[PDB]
From a paper:
Enhanced ABA levels elicited in response to drought are perceived by the PYR/PYL/RCAR family of ABA receptors and the clade A subfamily of protein phosphatases type 2C (PP2Cs), which act as necessary ABA co-receptors in ternary complexes. In the resting state, PYLR/PYL/RCAR receptors display an open ABA binding cavity flanked by two highly conserved loops, named as gate/CL2/β3-β4 loop and latch/CL3/β5-β6 loop. Specifically, both gate and latch loops define a surface that enables the receptor to dock into the PP2C active site. The formation of receptor-ABA-phosphatase complexes causes the dissociation of different PP2C-SnRK2 complexes and abolishes PP2C-mediated inhibition of the SnRK2s, triggering ABA response.
This free space is filled with water molecules that interact with the polar side chain of Lys88, which is otherwise buried in a more hydrophobic environment in the WT receptor bound to SB (right). Thus, Lys88 of CsPYL15m is more amenable to polar interactions in the pocket of CsPYL15m bound to SB. Together, these structural insights may explain the enhanced sensitivity of CsPYL15m to SB. Recently, opabactin has been described as a powerful ABA agonist and a key feature for its enhanced interaction with ABA receptors in the presence of a carboxylate group that interacts with a conserved Lys residue in the ABA binding pocket. Both CsPYL1-SB-HAB1 and CsPYL15m-SB-HAB1 complexes lack such interaction of the agonist with the conserved Lys88 residue of the receptor; rather, the structures show that the hydrophobic CH2 of the SB linker faces a water-filled cavity harboring the side-chain NH3+ of Lys88 (middle and right).
Numbering used by the authors:
A (entry chain A): 20 to 209
B (entry chain B): 186 to 225, 227 to 273, 278 to 310, 314 to 507
The structure:
Amino acid sequence: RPTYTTHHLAIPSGVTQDEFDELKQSVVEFHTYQLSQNQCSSLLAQRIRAPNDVVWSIVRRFDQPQTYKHFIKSCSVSDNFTMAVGSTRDVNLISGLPAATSTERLDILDDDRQVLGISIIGGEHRLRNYRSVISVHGFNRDGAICTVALESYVVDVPEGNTEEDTRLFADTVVKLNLQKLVSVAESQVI
Amino acid sequence: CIPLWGTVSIQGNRSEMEDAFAVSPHFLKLPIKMLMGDHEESPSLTHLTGHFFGVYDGHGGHKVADYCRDRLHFALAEEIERIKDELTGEGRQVQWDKVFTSCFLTVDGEIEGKIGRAVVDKVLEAVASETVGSTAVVALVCSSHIVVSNCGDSRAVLFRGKEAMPLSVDHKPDREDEYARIENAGGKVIQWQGARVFGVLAMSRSIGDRYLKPYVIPEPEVTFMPRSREDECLILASDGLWDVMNNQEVCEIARRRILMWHKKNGAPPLAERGKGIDPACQAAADYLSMLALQKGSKDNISIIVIDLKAQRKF
Ligand SMILES: Cc1cc(=O)n(C)c2ccc(S(=O)(=O)NCc3ccccc3)cc12
Ligand SMILES: [Cl-]
Ligand SMILES: [Cl-]
Ligand SMILES: [Cl-]
Ligand SMILES: [Cl-]
Ligand SMILES: [Mn+2]
Ligand SMILES: [Mn+2]
Ligand SMILES: [Mn+2]
Ligand SMILES: [Mn+2]
């Protein structure tokens, strides 16, 4: 039958065993993909010293990815953009990358669960059929409030490359963006 | 040592201009001891005038290349000043690689917001986003020596006699030694539209690129080259040129275009030479840039042509 990712079987780097006892359920809910032939999938986590409502308010802005991601020269949306599911964005990337542009579709925008899902539907790049989900999770550590972001993706392995190659590259970009999100979110919270 | 040079710096098919360059003639008074010692009797000889040439191929943005254009030669002069207030053949080579290494590392740290920058006190602030960087290829030319310092895949090539001699070696991640250095530092190199550090950056060394420290380092390769009566020209250029044209052919074309200009136009009055571009060098730089575009280079293209002959008679 169809095959599925199993990111719930391992604690991602940067999460505690206690945190994962809660987050494990969220991996099943939001970060499980049906795998197609010759695809690659990864789950990344990032702790943020900010309340989950602050992190989500940043993450949810599908029209402004440059506020919490690297590599973007410019991003445009529709003239009548309303942030409905099915919105698209056209992104121009900075120079020097193995990619120049990206066209992306907003597939999940769940303000009730704080989950954002996007599918790459075009552009000049080598991550064909990339789909990703980021989910935001709040914790109260005896007065101390923090957030863990979970971000996963599934993508085709491009011809000429291995799954190890593809995960190394995609993980690197996702991790770097998650580190910008930390900086942007923590700088809005004393 | 009258500086003879010409330059072209074009954006070409790219949506942004991220190449920069700097030419500063008569910029430095290099202590004669950094170039040579005494030998049997020139007491007047206390320094030689040094001419500065630099090409900076930016990536991820323009601000690092622009900063190198505005700052790097002043950081070099500051390094040399520290040696004049603190004062061997093999020693000279080591001294120059120390001077240029310190200069390149100072600029890199200023860019990253980790070294303070002069404020008309010093301010710690990144010049550009952490994903912005630049190559740097720099040449110091005086009557006796050429010093080249390179970080990245822009290139300086000396034409001596009939042989093109690269004075830099491209810092690409698949270079055997650079590949080993990156992996030894804990990094990874992936073939992903060419050899790239973590699949992202197609360069093993650069100025800037804070996010890929300490895999992508600013330490340059430095070449201390005695000059020779056989020297013809020195070419500094970004890979917008070298990606479509061969080292030998570029040098030979520059020489032939310089000679063609002189054959048709004679030489300028020597009172006018060294003030601005040399028309023969400019004709060579112009021609090389138009050939690069004709050959389909779709990149920014920046070229400095330097004539190393005192005179050209037929
Ligand atoms: C599609 C794509 C491929 C590629 O190789 N790179 C370097 C990218 C860099 C950035 C982006 S973007 O910021 O527009 N979308 C966010 C994003 C980040 C990372 C992966 C997919 C989408 C997209 C890409
Ligand atoms: Cl472009
Ligand atoms: Cl920039
Ligand atoms: Cl020719
Ligand atoms: Cl000519
Ligand atoms: Mn460039
Ligand atoms: Mn650096
Ligand atoms: Mn190239
Ligand atoms: Mn280039």
